[PDB]
């Protein structure tokens, strides 16, 4: 109805728009509701054994950002997430700039809510 159809525009810079790609990657984002995100935060951590995952607020919606040990098609992460949704929207894309995306999601108009690693994510954990 008035559900979003993509991520907020300030994050497009960070996201891959080719959702049907055969290329397998290791960082992902999910834009959905507080409720759905609260659950996926725990499910994803267990299904993908994420090396890291965080949940961020934006009005009433949430954005999950997570890294995985092994690579996966964006298509696959999405399919898994969508099975938890019926009427709630949910957008899932691949993330290119890991530490920068995570940065933007830690500042206005966004904010961190919960993380799987204290202090969160440090810049030196990347190239």
Author numbering: 133 to 259
Question: What's the paper's own text on this?
Answer:
The subject of this study, the JC virus (JCV), is a member of this family and the causative agent of a brain disease termed Progressive Multifocal Leukoencephalopathy (PML), a disease that is often fatal and for which there is no cure. Herein we present the high-resolution crystal structure of the origin binding domain (OBD) from the JCV initiator protein large T-antigen. The T-antigens encoded by polyomaviruses are multi-domain, multifunctional proteins that form hexamers and double hexamers at origins of replication. The topology of the JCV OBD is a five-stranded antiparallel β-sheet sandwiched between two helices on either side.
The JCV OBD (residues 132–261) crystallized in three different forms that were termed form 1, form 2 and form 3. The four structures are very similar; a superposition of the four JCV OBD structures revealed root mean-squared deviations (RMSDs) of less than 0.5 Å. JCV OBD region B3 (residues 216–220) is poorly ordered in crystal forms 1 and 2, but well ordered in form 3. This loop is also poorly ordered in several of the SV40 OBD structures. To better understand how the JCV T-ag OBDs may assemble during oligomerization, we examined the interactions among the OBDs within the three crystal forms. As described in this section, the largest interface between adjacent molecules is the same in all three crystals. To extend these analyses, we examined the interactions among OBDs within crystal forms 2 and 3. Therefore, crystal forms 2 and 3 were superimposed on one OBD from crystal form 1 and the relevant symmetry mates displayed (crystal form 1 is colored as in Fig. 8A, while the other two forms are colored gray). Furthermore, the near perfect superposition indicates that the interfaces are nearly identical. In addition, crystal forms 2 and 3 also formed a right-handed tetrameric spiral (data not shown).
